[PDB]
Amino acid sequence: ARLAANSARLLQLHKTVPQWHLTDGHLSIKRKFQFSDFNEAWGFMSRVALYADKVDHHPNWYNVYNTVDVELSTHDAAGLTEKDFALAKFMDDAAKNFE
Amino acid sequence: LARLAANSARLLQLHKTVPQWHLTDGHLSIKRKFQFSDFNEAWGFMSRVALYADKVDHHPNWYNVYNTVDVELSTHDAAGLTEKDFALAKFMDDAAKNFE
Amino acid sequence: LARLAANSARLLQLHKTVPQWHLTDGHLSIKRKFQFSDFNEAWGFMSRVALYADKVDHHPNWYNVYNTVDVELSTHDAAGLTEKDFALAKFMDDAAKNFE
Amino acid sequence: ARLAANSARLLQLHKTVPQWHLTDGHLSIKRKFQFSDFNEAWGFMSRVALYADKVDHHPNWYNVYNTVDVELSTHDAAGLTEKDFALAKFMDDAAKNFE
Numbered sequence: 444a445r446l447a448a449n450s451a452r453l454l455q456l457h458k459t460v461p462q463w464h465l466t467d468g469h470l471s472i473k474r475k476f477q478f479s480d481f482n483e484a485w486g487f488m489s490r491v492a493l494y495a496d497k498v499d500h501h502p503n504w505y506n507v508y509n510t511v512d513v514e515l516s517t518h519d520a521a522g523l524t525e526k527d528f529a530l531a532k533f534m535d536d537a538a539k540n541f542e
Numbered sequence: 543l544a545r546l547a548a549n550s551a552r553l554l555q556l557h558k559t560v561p562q563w564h565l566t567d568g569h570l571s572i573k574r575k576f577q578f579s580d581f582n583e584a585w586g587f588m589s590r591v592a593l594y595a596d597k598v599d600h601h602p603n604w605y606n607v608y609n610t611v612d613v614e615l616s617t618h619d620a621a622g623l624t625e626k627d628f629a630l631a632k633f634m635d636d637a638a639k640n641f642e
Numbered sequence: 643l644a645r646l647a648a649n650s651a652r653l654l655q656l657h658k659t660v661p662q663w664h665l666t667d668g669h670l671s672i673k674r675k676f677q678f679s680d681f682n683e684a685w686g687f688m689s690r691v692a693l694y695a696d697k698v699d700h701h702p703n704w705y706n707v708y709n710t711v712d713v714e715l716s717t718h719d720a721a722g723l724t725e726k727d728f729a730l731a732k733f734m735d736d737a738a739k740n741f742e
Numbered sequence: 743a744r745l746a747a748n749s750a751r752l753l754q755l756h757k758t759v760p761q762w763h764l765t766d767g768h769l770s771i772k773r774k775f776q777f778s779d780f781n782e783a784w785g786f787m788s789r790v791a792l793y794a795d796k797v798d799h800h801p802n803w804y805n806v807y808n809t810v811d812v813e814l815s816t817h818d819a820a821g822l823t824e825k826d827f828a829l830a831k832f833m834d835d836a837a838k839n840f841e
């Protein structure tokens with residue numbers, strides 16, 4: 444179950460994915476990725492897809508062209524869990540390759 | 543190419559070909575929401591739409607959660623609908639048919 | 643898991659479920675060659691197989707040219723066929739069905 | 743039509759994609775990509791896919807796990823053309839992100 448706002452464990456995880464913003468009573472984390480074209484954006488998403496289905500944890504993301512806008516939270520626990528941070532972390536790494 | 547006009551005859555004609563889609567409001571764009579069994583399908587779906595989109599250089603605004611993919615289409619440089627939006631819409635429906 | 647043995651009863655039974663596939667030679671692996679209209683389909687196809695493969699951690703050897711995707715499956719750490727190879731094979735056939 | 747072996751134009755293109763080997767009477771170019779896992783390999787392939795269908799020119803590639811083994815040539819001209827080099831180049835760039 445579901446990580447608590449300003450919680451010790453929470454802030455400790457959020458340390459490792461600093462570029463992501465917390466909602467709005469710590470119920471989720473958002474971040475907005477920007478890549479050079481759609482081709483890059485897709486390459487990105489593609490890796491995230493493979494990982495997501497693997498660990499059975501999925502993003503809510505909104506792609507337009509080179510933008511990919513993500514908001515993450517554990518549905519089944521109605522807020523943040525460990526899973527959301529492992530995802531955000533993966534995304535951050537995957538996206539780093541494009542810098 | 544030239545920005546199509548609301549309830550225009552051209553427009554309504556194309557729309558007839560892609561009936562599952564709702565027009566905004568008015569008639570600035572077209573929405574539809576796909577539902578597949580799982581993520582795996584949804585992605586198989588999106589994957590093909592990706593290929594087509596980069597080909598014809600015209601891209602969706604879609605929002606994916608799990609097995610649902612929620613699209614809204616319109617030519618940005620046209621600030622409304624044009625031919626390309628319906629070209630897309632149709633692919634997309636065909637692509638999505640295979641999962642029925 | 644345990645390396646399945648040639649013409650073994652277990653083996654033949656699974657194979658019955660995935661009949662379009664040819665066994666090597668002998669019976670170290672299983673081959674099949676998919677043909678779709680275009681590349682776009684083939685990729686839609688591969689895309690889903692990708693998702694599944696990284697999930698179940700068991701991966702194909704496939705060779706893609708355009709609209710044909712040519713697979714050969716076998717558990718490497720087992721140096722022959724095992725359950726996983728047939729799990730795959732079946733997905734793959736289902737995945738590929740949607741394009742008929 | 744179809745670039746000629748040791749041709750001036752040929753060697754000049756091949757300069758820009760040095761890591762690729764020439765066949766065997768300059769009929770095509772091969773190269774073997776190696777990534778950390780399949781997840782990376784797919785991210786790679788995914789970008790190459792998008793470009794390929796766009797420029798209507800496709801690879802012959804053979805993926806196993808983290809390996810992707812490519813051989814490129816213009817089918818319709820039975821040998822190398824410009825197209826093969828634009829592809830190889832794209833691949834090289836796409837793959838560079840993983841170093």
Ligand SMILES: C[C@H](O)[C@H](O)C1CNC2=NC(N)=NC(=O)C2=N1
Nearest residue numbers: 499500501516517518519520608
């Ligand atoms: C229960 C549900 O049908 C699936 O197993 C998924 C999809 N992946 C998921 N992703 C997220 N973020 N929360 C979930 O509860 C979740 N469960």
Ligand SMILES: C[C@H](O)[C@H](O)C1CNC2=NC(N)=NC(=O)C2=N1
Nearest residue numbers: 508599600601616617618619620
């Ligand atoms: C003109 C522009 O900079 C790019 O070529 C793009 C990106 N892809 C596009 N996608 C959509 N939907 N409309 C466009 O006008 C468009 N043009």
Ligand SMILES: C[C@H](O)[C@H](O)C1CNC2=NC(N)=NC(=O)C2=N1
Nearest residue numbers: 699700701716717718719720807
């Ligand atoms: C044990 C090994 O290092 C990895 O976990 C992998 C890579 N994926 C694999 N794929 C296949 N086909 N057989 C394996 O044994 C396998 N194991």
Ligand SMILES: C[C@H](O)[C@H](O)C1CNC2=NC(N)=NC(=O)C2=N1
Nearest residue numbers: 708798799800815816817818819
């Ligand atoms: C003629 C053919 O059906 C397609 O238009 C393709 C696929 N892409 C291609 N790729 C390569 N390498 N050579 C081709 O001739 C080619 N043509």
